[PDB]
Amino acid sequence: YAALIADWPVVVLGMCTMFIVVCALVGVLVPELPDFSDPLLGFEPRGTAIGQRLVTWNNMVKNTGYKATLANYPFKYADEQASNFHKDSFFCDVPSDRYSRVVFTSSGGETLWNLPAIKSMCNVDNSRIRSHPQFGDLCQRTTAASCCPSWTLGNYIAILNNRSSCQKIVERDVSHTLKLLRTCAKHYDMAARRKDQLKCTNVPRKCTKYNAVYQILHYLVDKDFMTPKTADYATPALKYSMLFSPTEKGESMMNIYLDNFENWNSSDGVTTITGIEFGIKHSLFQDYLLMDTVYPAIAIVIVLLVMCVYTKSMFITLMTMFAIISSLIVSYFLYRVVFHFEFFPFMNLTALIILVGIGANNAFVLCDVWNYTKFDKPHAETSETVSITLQHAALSMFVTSFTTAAAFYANYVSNITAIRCFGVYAGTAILVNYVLMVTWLPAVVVLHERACQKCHKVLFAISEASRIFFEKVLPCIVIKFRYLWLFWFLALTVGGAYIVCINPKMKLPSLELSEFQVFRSSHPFERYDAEYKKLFMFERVHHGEELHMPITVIWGVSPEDNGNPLNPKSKGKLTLDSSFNIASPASQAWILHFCQKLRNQTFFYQTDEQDFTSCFIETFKQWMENQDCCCSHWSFPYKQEIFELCIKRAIMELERSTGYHLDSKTPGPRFDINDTIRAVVLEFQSTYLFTLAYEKMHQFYKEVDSWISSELSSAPEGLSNGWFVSNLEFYDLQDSLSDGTLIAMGLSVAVAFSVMLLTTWNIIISLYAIISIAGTIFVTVGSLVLLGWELNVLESVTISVAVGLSVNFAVHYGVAYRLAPDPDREGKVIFSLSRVGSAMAMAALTTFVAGAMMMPSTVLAYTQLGTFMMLIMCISWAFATFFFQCMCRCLGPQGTCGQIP
Ligand SMILES: CC(C)CCC[C@@H](C)[C@H]1CC[C@H]2[C@@H]3CC=C4C[C@@H](OC(=O)CCC(=O)O)CC[C@]4(C)[C@H]3CC[C@]12C
Ligand SMILES: CC(C)CCC[C@@H](C)[C@H]1CC[C@H]2[C@@H]3CC=C4C[C@@H](OC(=O)CCC(=O)O)CC[C@]4(C)[C@H]3CC[C@]12C
Ligand SMILES: CC(C)CCC[C@@H](C)[C@H]1CC[C@H]2[C@@H]3CC=C4C[C@@H](OC(=O)CCC(=O)O)CC[C@]4(C)[C@H]3CC[C@]12C
Ligand SMILES: CC(C)CCC[C@@H](C)[C@H]1CC[C@H]2[C@@H]3CC=C4C[C@@H](OC(=O)CCC(=O)O)CC[C@]4(C)[C@H]3CC[C@]12C
Ligand SMILES: CC(C)CCC[C@@H](C)[C@H]1CC[C@H]2[C@@H]3CC=C4C[C@@H](OC(=O)CCC(=O)O)CC[C@]4(C)[C@H]3CC[C@]12C
Ligand SMILES: CC(C)CCC[C@@H](C)[C@H]1CC[C@H]2[C@@H]3CC=C4C[C@@H](OC(=O)CCC(=O)O)CC[C@]4(C)[C@H]3CC[C@]12C
Ligand SMILES: CC(C)CCC[C@@H](C)[C@H]1CC[C@H]2[C@@H]3CC=C4C[C@@H](OC(=O)CCC(=O)O)CC[C@]4(C)[C@H]3CC[C@]12C
Ligand SMILES: CC(C)CCC[C@@H](C)[C@H]1CC[C@H]2[C@@H]3CC=C4C[C@@H](OC(=O)CCC(=O)O)CC[C@]4(C)[C@H]3CC[C@]12C
Ligand SMILES: CC(C)CCC[C@@H](C)[C@H]1CC[C@H]2[C@@H]3CC=C4C[C@@H](OC(=O)CCC(=O)O)CC[C@]4(C)[C@H]3CC[C@]12C
Ligand SMILES: CC(C)CCC[C@@H](C)[C@H]1CC[C@H]2[C@@H]3CC=C4C[C@@H](OC(=O)CCC(=O)O)CC[C@]4(C)[C@H]3CC[C@]12C
Ligand SMILES: CC(C)CCC[C@@H](C)[C@H]1CC[C@H]2[C@@H]3CC=C4C[C@@H](OC(=O)CCC(=O)O)CC[C@]4(C)[C@H]3CC[C@]12C
Ligand SMILES: *[C@@H]1O[C@H](CO)[C@@H](O)[C@H](O)[C@H]1NC(C)=O
Ligand SMILES: *[C@@H]1O[C@H](CO)[C@@H](O)[C@H](O)[C@H]1NC(C)=O
Ligand SMILES: *[C@@H]1O[C@H](CO)[C@@H](O)[C@H](O)[C@H]1NC(C)=O
Ligand SMILES: *[C@@H]1O[C@H](CO)[C@@H](O)[C@H](O)[C@H]1NC(C)=O
């Protein structure tokens, strides 16, 4: 093979170039452009035995009945034969959470009860919001000039006074309202009085305006809550104050934020803006993404310089960077076209950075080996030199790349879709980059055969410095101490294990699915949702608003998920039916007995006022004991000939008599299009309060499912029947994250250990390598959990990639343990050090820098990836070198080897 790369470089160069050009061209032309519109799109498990039920339930809700061509699941249609408002008080409506808002703080002295702060609120509202051309104002009064007031606290100060305006303040109404709140705050024990002209019930005081006090304490500023155990001084300090806006929130608002809020720190010296809610956190996202392609580019540039210092040429560095980019391109082509599945979950974006930190990890090695094979046997042909260097470097480069490739492929086990796609893409990228490192680089190396004094002398100075560093002093500083490092790293390993296994481990996520932190942790959009949603009362009351958890039993459809689950488009499913029957009287009696028994439990909650949300057979039987209509005065289980008609007549009569809305969620039995009772749906109220934690939800699900699983029913409606499905999907996400992470970590560790054992043929060295990998994993994850982290759809992949990146700085030191000198421990170490220390140090430094350049970004994935890469590379290099070399006091010259070659 070596004869090919020799004397024929341009051939393979042109061939690879044409292959890459056609690959890029097809991959750009044929498939469609990715969306990036939704930052979170694949974060839903599939085929987890609960995701199937959630999908089937959401499909059942989708196909509601319609008066005109229901076309599926109508309620009764085939047989159906039909033939506040005042404009006074300057305000439109009570405050709600469907209007845009901001929050002011950061005053001098931490107190805003003063004319400056209120006037600044009014001024910034008039300047940054009203001045922009806007048509979203309510304009309750037909006059556009009186569209709506600014809704500040000064407006309430004014309306509590006789003269009302945003500007004209007397400074006496301020003190009046301060005393008013100081004396009537204890009444908040009360609710909205609706003081149009007076209130009905016995009120605490008859000096209440149109819900003035209740609004100012409930919806507006509520930091202190005005009921603490502080001093009797009627002047307490308030921290944060919220200000609404009459216009609605949504994608329409985004324009305003583009113009006035991006660059401006604070409008006034006395007030600032520390939290904003316009409802555009997930729509603006895409834009910032583009704005943060600066930091990657710079990183790439820096990398080049480093290589241009190590490999003295620039040709090699340029061709290596081209090889990496080419690998990304051809990997995308293999991803979208031949593999045939279509989804680009934006996590693949953060793949680029990773590859830049791993593509060079081999280049150096190759070049290095070449130079060595050039020092020995100087007078030689290119073919034999190429064959020698290939035999010396190919196996090591393949092990180094394939371990990480396997670690990235092992994420094809988890159920989430984003993780699956990211794993497949990154694995293919790494393997293709290895193939290019084996084919493209030898060609360019062979082909490369070709104030100067100052640059040359300083470069030689740097070269001799690096040589004397990695050749003399590092072996001494590593092998002389030899006892501080052992105990130090054992202490660090034990501490990491204690932080991962005993003291607070990686807590499962707590924010809801719709409120994932996507931007930086200091952006206004994120600071609001992190703190001020929890510090204000009008949203804290909704937070855990005593919502009980429902049950749901369905017999019609079958829990069958068929939506191309193999990396789906995350779209497209289908419903279906079954072959049971509910017509037999035995089935009716069994349903009655099932309801009677299910009410005899400890998880069922009782309310005494259920009309129809409970079982329908009970309400139907209650509709009996009547006549003059046909069937009356019979036994309970009927011959179903009358029942087929009575079940329509009764449901029609009841839906006519009561029920303003009974569609798409109510437990009424579901008919087919023409004539039958296809599906039935029962629901009950439980007593578990819908916590957001994991343990309680797990307990509830396990208990209710284990109880309802026992059916022992008639032949019809017994199979495909159980179908307990509550609103538990966040618990599904948490469980899927946990299981996927565990299994992927296990597989990655197994592959790493197997490859490390098969590459050296020595168990004594494999054991030390395993100890080092374990220590690195433990310390890295301990540091990550100390900084404050939690399992998400990124850290779950990072934990698995850490194992793959760990063995890198150990396979090389194990391979470099094959040499001529005999001495067991104090020998055969300086050789490996002086030979591979420079390569390992440079290979770690380049990815350290390429990861550290991501810190100033704004998107959160970039920051997290940067800090993780920095941490893992520092810790892995330190452990590998110091530990692995220092713990070589236990190996001899013929400890152990393999049996048969
Ligand atoms: C598509 C891009 C990204 C890669 C293109 C790769 C090749 C088509 C190019 C890249 C650099 C080129 C080389 C740049 C310089 C030279 C030296 C040139 O000879 C001289 O400069 C004369 C003096 C001497 O040889 O001493 C002969 C062509 C050659 C080998 C070129 C051959 C074609 C090469 C390998
Ligand atoms: C240094 C070399 C070897 C690699 C460079 C990698 C990146 C820094 C490059 C590759 C893709 C480039 C992007 C390709 C396309 C676009 C869209 C382009 O969009 C517009 O010009 C929008 C305005 C308009 O179209 O009128 C702006 C530059 C940008 C983000 C480019 C920015 C620079 C990127 C990220
Ligand atoms: C150690 C390494 C070399 C092992 C192989 C790793 C990857 C090359 C493999 C692992 C799992 C594979 C995937 C497993 C299953 C599928 C579904 C498969 O579906 C079909 O073939 C559908 C055919 C049709 O109906 O048209 C397409 C390839 C794909 C994505 C595979 C692509 C190649 C993958 C990523
Ligand atoms: C992997 C990173 C570290 C390097 C840079 C690559 C990406 C960050 C670049 C390459 C392609 C770029 C995209 C190319 C085209 C578009 C479409 C563009 O669409 C619109 O402006 C409107 C679309 C519509 O609504 O129809 C928005 C920016 C976006 C997503 C760009 C965002 C930035 C992207 C993803
Ligand atoms: C799909 C295409 C474009 C690329 C496929 C990759 C092959 C071109 C690579 C993959 C692994 C390579 C092999 C890896 C290692 C060796 C051992 C090497 O052994 C020697 O020359 C021994 C020299 C000595 O005695 O020191 C000979 C080349 C060879 C077979 C390599 C030949 C090129 C191979 C087959
Ligand atoms: C290889 C090393 C780095 C560990 C990698 C995994 C850990 C970083 C994470 C992933 C899954 C996590 C677990 C996911 C779920 C749970 C159950 C959770 O259970 C409860 O809260 C109590 C009720 C119960 O025991 O189920 C306690 C934390 C724990 C063990 C977590 C502990 C930390 C784990 C093992
Ligand atoms: C190279 C290898 C050796 C690295 C380490 C891999 C495993 C040996 C680690 C990774 C995750 C660890 C687990 C993380 C969390 C737990 C839960 C812990 O139990 C609880 O937290 C129970 C809490 C409760 O009572 O609700 C017991 C240890 C265990 C199983 C740990 C056992 C050791 C595990 C499997
Ligand atoms: C022989 C020497 C050169 C070895 C050096 C390697 C370790 C001793 C270093 C490298 C990574 C360092 C860690 C990187 C990050 C952190 C997290 C950091 O966390 C916090 O500061 C938590 C509190 C907070 O900031 O809110 C505490 C220090 C620590 C554990 C560092 C401790 C020292 C570590 C383990
Ligand atoms: C051995 C030689 C060749 C290199 C040694 C490099 C270190 C001495 C320096 C150079 C780059 C430095 C980093 C450059 C940028 C940052 C980001 C910086 O970020 C913040 O302060 C976070 C701000 C926030 O919380 O928003 C923290 C320090 C850090 C990691 C620096 C840590 C110290 C580093 C690694
Ligand atoms: C070995 C030779 C060839 C290269 C050595 C490079 C380092 C000496 C320098 C050059 C570029 C530096 C980086 C340039 C920019 C930044 C971003 C900077 O970001 C912040 O300070 C974060 C601010 C924030 O929190 O918003 C942190 C230091 C860092 C990583 C620097 C760390 C030190 C680096 C890598
Ligand atoms: C000089 C080099 C060769 C050896 C010593 C390196 C340490 C001084 C570096 C390595 C990792 C660094 C840490 C990497 C990341 C962070 C997170 C950073 O906080 C953020 O930017 C936000 C993090 C987040 O949001 O998750 C604060 C600095 C810190 C602890 C860095 C502190 C300095 C550390 C320990
Ligand atoms: C203040 O109150 C008096 C009597 O209650 C009323 O006549 C007067 O109009 C009020 N002030 C203003 C500016 O309306
Ligand atoms: C914000 O920066 C501007 C100049 O860019 C400055 O005039 C203003 O005083 C700053 N804000 C504060 C609160 O000082
Ligand atoms: C359920 O309620 C009480 C005991 O909880 C009992 O009198 C009644 O008979 C029970 N019903 C059934 C069907 O067991
Ligand atoms: C509608 O129901 C009638 C019942 O007799 C049946 O004959 C017919 O095939 C049904 N049509 C469809 C499209 O299911």
Author numbering: 181 to 263, 285 to 389, 400 to 661, 687 to 865, 873 to 1144
Please share excerpts from the published article on this structure.
The membrane protein Dispatched (Disp), which belongs to the RND family of small molecule transporters, is essential for Hedgehog (Hh) signaling, by catalyzing the extracellular release of palmitate- and cholesterol-modified Hh ligands from producing cells. Also uniquely among RND proteins, Disp activity requires Furin-mediated cleavage at a conserved site in its first large extracellular domain (ECD1), yielding a mature Disp protein consisting of two non-covalently associated fragments.
Ultimately, a triple-point mutant (hereafter hDisp1NNN) in which three conserved aspartate residues located in transmembrane helices TM4 and TM10 (Asp572, Asp573, and Asp1051) are mutated to asparagine, showed sufficient expression and was well behaved biochemically after purification in detergent; this Disp1 mutant is known to bind Shh stronger than WT Disp1. Notably, the hDisp1NNN-3C preparation was devoid of the low molecular weight species found in purified hDisp1NNN, indicating that Furin cleavage had been successfully abolished. We solved the structure of uncleaved hDisp1NNN-3C at overall resolution of 3.61 Å, and the structure of hDisp1NNN-3C-cleaved at 3.68 Å. A connecting loop between residues 263–285 in ECD1 (named the C-loop, for protease cleavage) is not well-resolved in our reconstruction, indicating its flexibility; we speculate that this permits its accessibility to Furin or 3C protease cleavage. The resolved C-loop is moved away from ECD2 in hDisp1NNN-3C-cleaved, suggesting that the uncleaved C-loop perhaps restricts the motions of the two ECDs, and that proteolytic cleavage allows them to move away from each other. Consistent with this model, extra density was observed at the C-loop position between the two ECDs in the EM map of uncleaved hDisp1NNN-3C at a low contour level, but no extra density was observed at the same position in the map of hDisp1NNN-3C-cleaved at the same or even lower contour level.
